[PDB]
């Protein structure tokens, strides 16, 4: 029973770290969307200009 | 001599023919807007999800 208990003890603290970290990462991808639109506009502009 | 004749004739007697910028437009890809900001909308707001998640998967850590 002590063996079972020891696993759970360590988990309880450390999991909270991952919990935060995971959402933090997701936030970064939101910001990446703003980038994506910047990238997009540049690509489009270069293409129209290339045709000219 | 013949060089002079050619030079004279070419430059003087004909130059560029008509050609419009408007006609050019057809043959090129024109600028168009990058429509949409593309706003993402918040997901999983409130403890509605949390109550659902606590209850839904009760599978304990082993």
UniProtKB/Swiss-Prot annotation, chain A:
Subcellular location(s) per record: Mitochondrion; Mitochondrion inner membrane
Any one GO cellular component localisation term in the record: mitochondrial inner membrane
Coiled-coil stretches noted in the UniProt entry, renumbered to this chain: none
Recorded GO MF terms: proton transmembrane transporter activity
Keywords, sorted A to Z: CF(0), Hydrogen ion transport, Ion transport, Membrane, Mitochondrion, Mitochondrion inner membrane, Phosphoprotein, Transit peptide, Transport
Residue positions, PTM Phosphoserine: 4
GO biological process: protein-containing complex assembly; proton motive force-driven ATP synthesis
Function field: Mitochondrial membrane ATP synthase (F(1)F(0) ATP synthase or Complex V) produces ATP from ADP in the presence of a proton gradient across the membrane which is generated by electron transport complexes of the respiratory chain. F-type ATPases consist of two structural domains, F(1) - containing the extramembraneous catalytic core, and F(0) - containing the membrane proton channel, linked together by a central stalk and a peripheral stalk. During catalysis, ATP synthesis in the catalytic domain of F(1) is coupled via a rotary mechanism of the central stalk subunits to proton translocation.
Family stated for the protein in its record: Belongs to the eukaryotic ATPase B chain family.
Assembly and binders: F-type ATPases have 2 components, CF(1) - the catalytic core - and CF(0) - the membrane proton channel. In yeast, the dimeric form of ATP synthase consists of 17 polypeptides: alpha, beta, gamma, delta, epsilon, 4 (B), 5 (OSCP), 6 (A), 8, 9 (C), d, E (Tim11), f, g, h, i/j and k.
Miscellaneous field: Present with 12900 molecules/cell in log phase SD medium.
Name of this protein: ATP synthase subunit 4, mitochondrial
Covered residues, full protein: 141 to 192 of 244
From Swiss-Prot, chain B:
GO CC entries: mitochondrial inner membrane; mitochondrion; proton-transporting ATP synthase complex
Entry keywords, A to Z: ATP synthesis, CF(0), Hydrogen ion transport, Ion transport, Membrane, Mitochondrion, Mitochondrion inner membrane, Transit peptide, Transport
Ranges annotated as spanning the membrane: none
Subcellular location: Mitochondrion; Mitochondrion inner membrane
GO BP: cristae formation; mitochondrial proton-transporting ATP synthase complex assembly; proton motive force-driven ATP synthesis; proton transmembrane transport
Similarity remark: Belongs to the ATPase h subunit family.
Miscellaneous information on this protein: Present with 6140 molecules/cell in log phase SD medium.
Task of the protein: Mitochondrial membrane ATP synthase (F(1)F(0) ATP synthase or Complex V) produces ATP from ADP in the presence of a proton gradient across the membrane which is generated by electron transport complexes of the respiratory chain. F-type ATPases consist of two structural domains, F(1) - containing the extramembraneous catalytic core and F(0) - containing the membrane proton channel, linked together by a central stalk and a peripheral stalk. During catalysis, ATP synthesis in the catalytic domain of F(1) is coupled via a rotary mechanism of the central stalk subunits to proton translocation.
Record's subunit section: F-type ATPases have 2 components, CF(1) - the catalytic core - and CF(0) - the membrane proton channel. In yeast, the dimeric form of ATP synthase consists of 17 polypeptides: alpha, beta, gamma, delta, epsilon, 4 (B), 5 (OSCP), 6 (A), 8, 9 (C), d, E (Tim11), f, g, h, i/j and k.
Protein's name according to its UniProt entry: ATP synthase subunit H, mitochondrial
Originating gene: ATP14
């Amino acid at each position: 029973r002590i063996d079972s208990v020891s696993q759970l003890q360590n988990v309880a603290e450390t999991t909270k770290v991952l919990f935060d970290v995971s959402k933090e990462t997701v936030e970064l991808e939101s910001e990446a969307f703003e980038l994506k639109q910047k990238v997009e506009l540049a690509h489009e502009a270069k293409a129209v200009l290339d045709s000219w | 001599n013949v060089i002079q004749d050619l030079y004279l004739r070419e430059l003087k007697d004909t130059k560029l023919a008509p050609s419009t910028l408007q006609d050019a437009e057809g043959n090129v890809k024109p600028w168009n807007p990058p429509q949409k900001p593309n706003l993402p909308e918040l997901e999983l707001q409130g403890p509605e999800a949390l109550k659902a998640y606590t209850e839904q998967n009760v599978e304990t850590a082993h």
